[PDB]
Amino acid sequence: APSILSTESSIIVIGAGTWGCSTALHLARRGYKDVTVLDPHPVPSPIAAGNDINKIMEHSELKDGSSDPRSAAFSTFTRAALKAWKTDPVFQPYFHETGFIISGHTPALIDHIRKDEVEPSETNFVKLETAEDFRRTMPPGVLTGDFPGWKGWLHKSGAGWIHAKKAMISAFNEAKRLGVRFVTGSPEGNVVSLVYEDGDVVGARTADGRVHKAHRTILSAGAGSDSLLDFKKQLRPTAWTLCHIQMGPEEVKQYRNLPVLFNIAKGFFMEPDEDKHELKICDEHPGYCNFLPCPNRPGQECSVPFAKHQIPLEAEARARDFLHDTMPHLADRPLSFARICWDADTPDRAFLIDRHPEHPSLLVAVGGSGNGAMQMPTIGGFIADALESKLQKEVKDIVRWRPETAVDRDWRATQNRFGGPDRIMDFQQVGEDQWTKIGES
Ligand SMILES: Cc1cc2nc3c(=O)[nH]c(=O)nc-3n(C[C@H](O)[C@H](O)[C@H](O)COP(=O)(O)OP(=O)(O)OC[C@H]3O[C@@H](n4cnc5c(N)ncnc54)[C@H](O)[C@@H]3O)c2cc1C
Numbered sequence: 001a002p003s004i005l006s007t008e009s010s011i012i013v014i015g016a017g018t019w020g021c022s023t024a025l026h027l028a029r030r031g032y033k034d035v036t037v038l039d040p041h042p043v044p045s046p047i048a049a050g051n052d053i054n055k056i057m058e059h060s061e062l063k064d065g066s067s068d069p070r071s072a073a074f075s076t077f078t079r080a081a082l083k084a085w086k087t088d089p090v091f092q093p094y095f096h097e098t099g100f101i102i103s104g105h106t107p108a109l110i111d112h113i114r115k116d117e118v119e120p121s122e123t124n125f126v127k128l129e130t131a132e133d134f135r136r137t138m139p140p141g142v143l144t145g146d147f148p149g150w151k152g153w154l155h156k157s158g159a160g161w162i163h164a165k166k167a168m169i170s171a172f173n174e175a176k177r178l179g180v181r182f183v184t185g186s187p188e189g190n191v192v193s194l195v196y197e198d199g200d201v202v203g204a205r206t207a208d209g210r211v212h213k214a215h216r217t218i219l220s221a222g223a224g225s226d227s228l229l230d231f232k233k234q235l236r237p238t239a240w241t242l243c244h245i246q247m248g249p250e251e252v253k254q255y256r257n258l259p260v261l262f263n264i265a266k267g268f269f270m271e272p273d274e275d276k277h278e279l280k281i282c283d284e285h286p287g288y289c290n291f292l293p294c295p296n297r298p299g300q301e302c303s304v305p306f307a308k309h310q311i312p313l314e315a316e317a318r319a320r321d322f323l324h325d326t327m328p329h330l331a332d333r334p335l336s337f338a339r340i341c342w343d344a345d346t347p348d349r350a351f352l353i354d355r356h357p358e359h360p361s362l363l364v365a366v367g368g369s370g371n372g373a374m375q376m377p378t379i380g381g382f383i384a385d386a387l388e389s390k391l392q393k394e395v396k397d398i399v400r401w402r403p404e405t406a407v408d409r410d411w412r413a414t415q416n417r418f419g420g421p422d423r424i425m426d427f428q429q430v431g432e433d434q435w436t437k438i439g440e441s
Helices: 018-030 069-087 107-118 131-135 164-177 222-227 313-326 376-387
Strands: 011-014 035-039 055-058 100-104 126-128 151-155 159-162 181-184 191-197 200-206 211-213 216-219 236-246 260-263 267-270 278-282 291-293 301-303 337-345 352-355 362-366
Touching (some): 011 200, 018 035, 018 164, 055 069, 069 376, 164 376, 200 216, 216 376, 222 236, 222 362, 236 313, 260 313, 267 313, 352 376, 362 376
Parallel strands (some): 035 181, 100 260, 216 362
Antiparallel strands (some): 100 151, 126 151, 191 200, 200 211, 236 278, 236 337, 267 278, 291 301, 352 362
């Protein structure tokens, strides 16, 4: 029998990343007086995927939606997220409604975007057919490439980019100010395992040995969640790569209020951040896994997350071939920063927010699956809903606990992503001299 939930209930959130801070904030705002958040790092965490100078936000509605319940759930998440990016003062300053370009460069990719993304959407786009159509979405001198074989779609409003790092900091700040307790650092906040009494989770044991007891334990640790609970293959830690190119104080002025340019098989980039003038590029691919035997001594293989402020040279290559099609004049610029970035993919890349059906006091909130950052303002809300057993019908069944969809899971399934070798890649098959070497020299 799980304890009756009230505002006095001591709550623990494991993980103060994108989803953790969002939850801490929402719990605070609802009247919960006893919320403690645990993280092995101070905000922003160096391993939190939400720690990026920028991420893409997009919201689309559907024609129908009875035709695709997975996607109808996503609109529900994003309709909420967009509204909050525009009205909630904690999040508002860090949304940049600059627009979103989705595109490809081969017949089958372009037809894919037409069929899966554009046709089903109630959104009205501007069809980009030529190299001038791409170049003229941005000020003179920003896009200067030939865009070979490229065809795309511009989405003006209800899409843009977000300063995820700062918004995560802003939410942390407001949660902390409304009275949430943040235990962020090692060993105090580094949770090494959960705590069981009578088949349920009574709290969290951290690396310092203390058992933090709670009536409800919320687990939101991103890629790290896999090594804290048996998720039954429902979470694939996968990594993606990014790198920063620093701009000059003179040239950087032209790269302002730029719409997100995404080619689903080459990558995307976002406008230079206001602080360091750094321009960010991700080479799009199905992702990097780090295949090792699981930490629990099996012959089962797993993707184990590690941290690195470098990227494989093969990713720098893919980034620069992207640069070359779009902004050739920046193609041979030296990188100023790079790192690998860890998320968790579910078998269908819908979120995982549910009470564990064997430990009712545990609430997992994980599996952002590449689309979790934009949800920042409001994800904590649906998480609070789930906790408060009122997760609305439009999403409940889609994001529920579902280990049967991960039976016989192919860890190398491309999960609707394209680019590079068009296969899942493995960090183990990348040499130690085959990474970038940023600084110095
Ligand atoms: C390269 C890249 C680009 C992306 N671009 C976008 C985008 O444009 N738009 C979008 O919506 N999404 C995007 N995503 C997904 C995005 O990163 C989301 O932020 C991700 O889904 C975040 O979910 P999260 O809060 O659960 O994880 P995180 O933000 O990573 O938070 C995890 C936190 O849990 C902590 N933690 C870890 N381990 C332990 C432990 N043992 N005990 C306690 N605590 C712990 C971590 O330190 C961290 O603070 C992108 C992802 C990547 C990798």
